[PDB]
Amino acid sequence: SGFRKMAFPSGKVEGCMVQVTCGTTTLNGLWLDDVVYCPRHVICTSEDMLNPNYEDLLIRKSNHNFLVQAGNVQLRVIGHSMQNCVLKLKVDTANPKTPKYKFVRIQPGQTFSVLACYNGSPSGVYQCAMRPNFTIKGSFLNGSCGSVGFNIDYDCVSFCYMHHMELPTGVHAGTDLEGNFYGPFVDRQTAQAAGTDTTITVNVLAWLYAAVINGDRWFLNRFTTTLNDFNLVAMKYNYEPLTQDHVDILGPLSAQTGIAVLDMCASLKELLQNGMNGRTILGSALLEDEFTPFDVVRQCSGVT
Amino acid sequence: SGFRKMAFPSGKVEGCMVQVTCGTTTLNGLWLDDVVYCPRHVICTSEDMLNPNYEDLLIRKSNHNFLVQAGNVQLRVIGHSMQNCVLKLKVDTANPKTPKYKFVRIQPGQTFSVLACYNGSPSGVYQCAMRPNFTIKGSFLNGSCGSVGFNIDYDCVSFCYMHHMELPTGVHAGTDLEGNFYGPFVDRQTAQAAGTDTTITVNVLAWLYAAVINGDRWFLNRFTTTLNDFNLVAMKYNYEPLTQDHVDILGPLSAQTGIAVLDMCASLKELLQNGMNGRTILGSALLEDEFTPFDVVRQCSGVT
Ligand SMILES: N#Cc1ccc(N2CCCOCC2)cn1
Ligand SMILES: N#Cc1ccc(N2CCCOCC2)cn1
């Protein structure tokens, strides 16, 4: 029993983190096979970041200008290339700790673990969601760029995020491991405002199921609703529209608890309209949206 | 910027987790040097757990009855002994992945990371606090016993918790790595009720400092208070008394922010008396108490 915001065990990723230095800029790289992946802005000064021309900046860089350190041992850079917003540094040694891995581009509402790193050294692990506005709400200080987000399925790490930038609102933006930003963000120090941070409705419902499984049941009511009726309320409260695909994804939790998805929607509707009245659900005073239906099943079933 | 509930990177601990089986009971063990540490209730059936005599049960057990598996490789048990509520299984092989480590017995209010495991395999990592009633609010299913709690200082793991039991209220109890329960709990399936789960005041204040550092400042008011005045309010709200030792520990956060500790206490006092009025602090609708002053400095400074 109990339900926690749980990250994946970080060891397989810790084994991949390196330090990348270009001139006076140090950040983190991801060492998989004989390639080190890092944000391309490693080549920028803070001055450069106001209006950088990455192709032009990169012309002035040679393999030997990229200092790659794995623990206290230096890696030999034998090639470099830019792919979108990441650099790929080819090194002469395959990472002996390379796990089974994939690169995946996640959808908004999907959760992942972040291994926050500085100077190639892990500092902490926490759980994030890709927000519907394609920001994440992370914990990243200067030096944390190149820290990565991942999921694990048994022994395969799926890398989905690399940390690039903080917006003036203190929310975070980054790329997949092909170097494509999530959302409209760019690796430039300019006016980039996030859109509406809507609530991930399917995740709230999952978490309400988690609450029922773990004994928090006070919010269950006598009502039901329809997708269209629920969605009128969702819209009013800046919740994502609930689709039949979302209903289908909650089916296993519905089956386990015997609470019809539309009945849980009617519980959520009353919580949106009435608030918590000073009560808590799974130790939270607000409706938590950074657990996916898959997360809730995983944690409630003890998957390793 | 940003402030997250962050666990320590779990890799050093993942490298220590094994499976222990005695008869039909499987749980987790901690493999450090040539000793595997696990809950003594590994020797119990569910029937035994109602009124177990561990010394009597252990007489019927030999080294070969303790099946210890590290990944898919079996360890040879060459000795066993009971220390308080843990068994120490001596194996013929030192764990080659043994990190620098210590065993520490933490005080209530101290935080730590839990690596939740099943069958010796890591499933997730999350941050806990030792509650003032010596319970923790974890996420543990059957098979999770022997999962451990730890802190890391650079390259030294300090192990502070081993998971033993869930109370009927769905809160958790366990031991330090000398096998001594935190609080009054016993490894028996009996009536064990937790006392008052008071709020860890020094941790709330730390987190309010974290909020100020990270731009959440709406709750700062024009007031101050005294320890005695604050403590009258703390008592009324089931907060731990604030001591001068706590004030001293918040000194660095006070210095960094320029907000006198007693001024932050007066902010907390108004939040206790007035509530949040539907506002949030660092994404929370309640006052968070599972960050220590050390946690806040660590996360706000990027310690690795
Ligand atoms: N947000 C953001 C941000 C700010 C500065 C920055 N630069 C390159 C990497 C670090 O070196 C200093 C300049 C990158 N990203
Ligand atoms: N809370 C609790 C609890 C419940 C059962 C239990 N036993 C020994 C280990 C697992 O085997 C089944 C019996 C131990 N702890």
Side-chain angles (χ1 to χ4, degrees):
Chain A
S1 222
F3 199 80
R4 276 278 185 180
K5 193 62 73 49
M6 189 176 280
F8 291 92
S10 61
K12 284 175 185 290
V13 179
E14 290 171 51
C16 300
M17 298 310 308
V18 298
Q19 181 188 78
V20 186
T21 303
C22 185
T24 64
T25 298
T26 295
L27 44 57
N28 307 280
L30 183 73
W31 183 22
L32 298 170
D33 302 324
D34 56 354
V35 180
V36 174
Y37 299 80
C38 74
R40 69 175 177 172
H41 70 33
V42 68
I43 73 181
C44 297
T45 68
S46 62
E47 317 88 74
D48 288 335
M49 285 298 299
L50 301 167
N51 191 25
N53 188 307
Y54 283 102
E55 280 286 17
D56 289 345
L57 290 176
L58 198 50
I59 294 164
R60 305 298 151 200
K61 300 302 179 188
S62 295
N63 292 334
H64 72 262
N65 295 126
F66 299 99
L67 303 176
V68 182
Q69 199 180 320
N72 270 83
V73 71
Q74 209 68 23
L75 298 187
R76 191 180 296 282
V77 181
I78 66 177
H80 67 276
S81 59
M82 182 163 61
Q83 186 179 9
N84 302 314
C85 297
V86 293
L87 303 173
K88 298 193 311 216
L89 311 172
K90 199 198 196 182
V91 290
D92 73 347
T93 302
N95 182 357
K97 302 182 188 172
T98 302
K100 294 178 210 189
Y101 73 91
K102 297 176 161 172
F103 294 169
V104 302
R105 182 178 182 83
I106 57 168
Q107 294 303 325
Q110 292 308 115
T111 59
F112 60 90
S113 301
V114 173
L115 183 65
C117 294
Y118 301 90
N119 300 117
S121 289
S123 63
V125 67
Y126 57 86
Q127 195 66 0
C128 278
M130 185 52 60
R131 300 312 307 173
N133 65 6
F134 295 100
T135 65
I136 70 170
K137 296 181 173 130
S139 170
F140 294 111
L141 301 172
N142 101 89
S144 66
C145 295
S147 298
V148 298
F150 59 97
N151 287 269
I152 309 174
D153 191 12
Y154 180 50
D155 67 353
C156 187
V157 183
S158 292
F159 293 100
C160 53
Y161 180 87
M162 180 167 275
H163 186 50
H164 287 244
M165 110 185 86
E166 180 165 77
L167 302 191
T169 46
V171 303
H172 298 120
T175 68
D176 63 17
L177 267 294
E178 303 179 342
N180 292 126
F181 270 84
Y182 289 100
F185 302 112
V186 298
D187 49 356
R188 185 179 171 211
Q189 195 187 309
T190 189
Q192 319 193 57
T196 308
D197 196 2
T198 62
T199 299
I200 309 152
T201 309
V202 67
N203 286 12
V204 174
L205 286 165
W207 170 84
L208 289 175
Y209 278 109
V212 170
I213 292 168
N214 289 280
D216 285 357
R217 321 198 143 134
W218 63 261
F219 56 82
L220 293 181
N221 59 34
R222 301 187 158 271
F223 315 143
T224 200
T225 181
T226 66
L227 272 192
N228 289 160
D229 179 62
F230 175 76
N231 282 336
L232 292 184
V233 175
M235 166 106 72
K236 165 167 142 90
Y237 286 92
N238 281 166
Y239 273 54
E240 289 300 284
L242 197 70
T243 68
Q244 188 59 44
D245 282 353
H246 294 136
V247 172
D248 293 349
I249 286 160
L250 290 167
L253 287 172
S254 179
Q256 199 195 316
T257 62
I259 301 159
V261 171
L262 285 180
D263 296 359
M264 192 68 86
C265 290
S267 279
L268 174 51
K269 170 172 153 195
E270 297 301 300
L271 286 171
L272 289 179
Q273 287 177 339
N274 296 338
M276 306 277 287
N277 285 116
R279 299 186 277 268
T280 65
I281 302 169
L282 288 177
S284 176
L286 54 73
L287 304 173
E288 297 282 336
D289 79 341
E290 292 197 356
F291 299 98
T292 68
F294 296 103
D295 292 339
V296 169
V297 168
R298 189 180 307 106
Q299 180 169 167
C300 292
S301 84
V303 176
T304 62
Chain B
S1 222
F3 199 80
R4 276 278 185 180
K5 193 62 73 49
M6 189 176 280
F8 291 92
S10 61
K12 284 175 185 290
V13 179
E14 290 171 51
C16 300
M17 298 310 308
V18 298
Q19 181 188 78
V20 186
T21 303
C22 185
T24 64
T25 298
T26 295
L27 44 57
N28 307 280
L30 183 73
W31 183 22
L32 298 170
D33 302 324
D34 56 354
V35 180
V36 174
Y37 299 80
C38 74
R40 69 175 177 172
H41 70 33
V42 68
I43 73 181
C44 297
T45 68
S46 62
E47 317 88 74
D48 288 335
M49 285 298 299
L50 301 167
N51 191 25
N53 188 307
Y54 283 102
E55 280 286 17
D56 289 345
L57 290 176
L58 198 50
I59 294 164
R60 305 298 151 200
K61 300 302 179 188
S62 295
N63 292 334
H64 72 262
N65 295 126
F66 299 99
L67 303 176
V68 182
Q69 199 180 320
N72 270 83
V73 71
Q74 209 68 23
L75 298 187
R76 191 180 296 282
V77 181
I78 66 177
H80 67 276
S81 59
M82 182 163 61
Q83 186 179 9
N84 302 314
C85 297
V86 293
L87 303 173
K88 298 193 311 216
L89 311 172
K90 199 198 196 182
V91 290
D92 73 347
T93 302
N95 182 357
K97 302 182 188 172
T98 302
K100 294 178 210 189
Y101 73 91
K102 297 176 161 172
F103 294 169
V104 302
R105 182 178 182 83
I106 57 168
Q107 294 303 325
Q110 292 308 115
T111 59
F112 60 90
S113 301
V114 173
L115 183 65
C117 294
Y118 301 90
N119 300 117
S121 289
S123 63
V125 67
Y126 57 86
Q127 195 66 0
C128 278
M130 185 52 60
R131 300 312 307 173
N133 65 6
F134 295 100
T135 65
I136 70 170
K137 296 181 173 130
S139 170
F140 294 111
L141 301 172
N142 101 89
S144 66
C145 295
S147 298
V148 298
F150 59 97
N151 287 269
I152 309 174
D153 191 12
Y154 180 50
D155 67 353
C156 187
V157 183
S158 292
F159 293 100
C160 53
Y161 180 87
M162 180 167 275
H163 186 50
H164 287 244
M165 110 185 86
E166 180 165 77
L167 302 191
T169 46
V171 303
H172 298 120
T175 68
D176 63 17
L177 267 294
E178 303 179 342
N180 292 126
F181 270 84
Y182 289 100
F185 302 112
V186 298
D187 49 356
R188 185 179 171 211
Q189 195 187 309
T190 189
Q192 319 193 57
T196 308
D197 196 2
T198 62
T199 299
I200 309 152
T201 309
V202 67
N203 286 12
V204 174
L205 286 165
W207 170 84
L208 289 175
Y209 278 109
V212 170
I213 292 168
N214 289 280
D216 285 357
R217 321 198 143 134
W218 63 261
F219 56 82
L220 293 181
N221 59 34
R222 301 187 158 271
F223 315 143
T224 200
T225 181
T226 66
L227 272 192
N228 289 160
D229 179 62
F230 175 76
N231 282 336
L232 292 184
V233 175
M235 166 106 72
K236 165 167 142 90
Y237 286 92
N238 281 166
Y239 273 54
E240 289 300 284
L242 197 70
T243 68
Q244 188 59 44
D245 282 353
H246 294 136
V247 172
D248 293 349
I249 286 160
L250 290 167
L253 287 172
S254 179
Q256 199 195 316
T257 62
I259 301 159
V261 171
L262 285 180
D263 296 359
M264 192 68 86
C265 290
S267 279
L268 174 51
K269 170 172 153 195
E270 297 301 300
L271 286 171
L272 289 179
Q273 287 177 339
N274 296 338
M276 306 277 287
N277 285 116
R279 299 186 277 268
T280 65
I281 302 169
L282 288 177
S284 176
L286 54 73
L287 304 173
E288 297 282 336
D289 79 341
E290 292 197 356
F291 299 98
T292 68
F294 296 103
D295 292 339
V296 169
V297 168
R298 189 180 307 106
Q299 180 169 167
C300 292
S301 84
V303 176
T304 62

